[PDB]
Amino acid sequence: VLTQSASVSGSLGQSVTISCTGPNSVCCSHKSISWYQWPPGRAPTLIIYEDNERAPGISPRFSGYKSYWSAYLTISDLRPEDETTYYCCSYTHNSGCVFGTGTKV
Amino acid sequence: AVFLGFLGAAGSTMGAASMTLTVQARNLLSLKLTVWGIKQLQARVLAVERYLRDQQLLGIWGCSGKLICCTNVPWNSSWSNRNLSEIWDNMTWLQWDKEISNYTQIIYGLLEESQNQQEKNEQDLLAL
């Protein structure tokens, strides 16, 4: 129900802008958005939470943004280790996170 | 409401315990020379000494009679690079003092001269 992006890529030095949106059920103005860097079949990683706040240790090139209808995840200054699958997820303070479909970068 | 008591929020988050400061503030201060009498007199002079050393530092920082005073000394990230949400909504005041313990003397000087210079600036502004 939280339709992410199909996929895309850039190049070493450029940037990416992943998307994430849905209906009034899981998006957006009354929900927070978190983005997980999730290699397939491995331990995931919390990149940002609360729409744009990064986790401790996340590179400043990772940036989040939430419009009134869609949340974005920019990945500036690409590096080799960025070839992973990213997932957004929407949540409130007293619920669970409805993850997104997925996006191969 | 809650009212956890004296030191009741010692295991609570720093942001939670920062709302019950009067609880610990009021318990910081409240002759025959026998073995018990000498013992009690030492407990009395020690309490007033410890209470006034903290009030002295609170004075040379421009924080007299304040439970929460804001300063002008910026936070050198070399002290703690943690963010606000992972400090006030995560750590407790006990473990916070455990990792800020090395730099507590560095900060106590920056607040001391920032107040000495501020009161010198305030006198210059009221000189007209």
Partner: protein, 128 residues
């Protein structure tokens, strides 16, 4: 720090009910929720539910409303801020369509709006 070693990656067949273990270290096990996340192959990653090692209060997705039993045992104090805990996961009317890698992840913060958020994950376990 913090670690969440998970159980073995053995396999069973439909109709059964397996238990998944998650052993914690390097952090106070009572201060953060324990989340159970599923990464199936024929579906997007799903959040199954979190439970409170401190209050015992559990909360799971309605897709696992009456099929999953989440339990945690009390922690063992190692130091003032370090303990060891364990979290358990079970399934009821189990088939072979729930196949995938299962993870356990502790909460993010102790207070705020991102309290239970799966922050520190385990290595995962392969299933049927």
């Amino acid at each position: 720090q913090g670690q969440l070693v998970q159980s073995g990656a053995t396999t069973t067949k439909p109709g059964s009910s397996v238990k998944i273990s998650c052993k914690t270290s390097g952090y106070r096990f009572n201060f953060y929720h324990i989340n159970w996340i599923r990464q199936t192959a024929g579906r997007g990653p799903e959040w199954m539910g979190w439970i409170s090692p401190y209050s015992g209060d559990k909360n799971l997705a309605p897709a696992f409303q009456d099929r999953v039993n989440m339990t945690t045992d009390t922690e063992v104090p190692v130091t003032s801020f370090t303990s060891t805990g364990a979290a358990y996961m079970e399934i009821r009317n189990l088939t072979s369509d729930d196949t995938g890698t299962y993870f356990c992840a502790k909460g993010l913060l102790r207070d705020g709006s991102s309290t239970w958020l799966p922050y520190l994950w385990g290595q995962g376990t392969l299933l049927t």
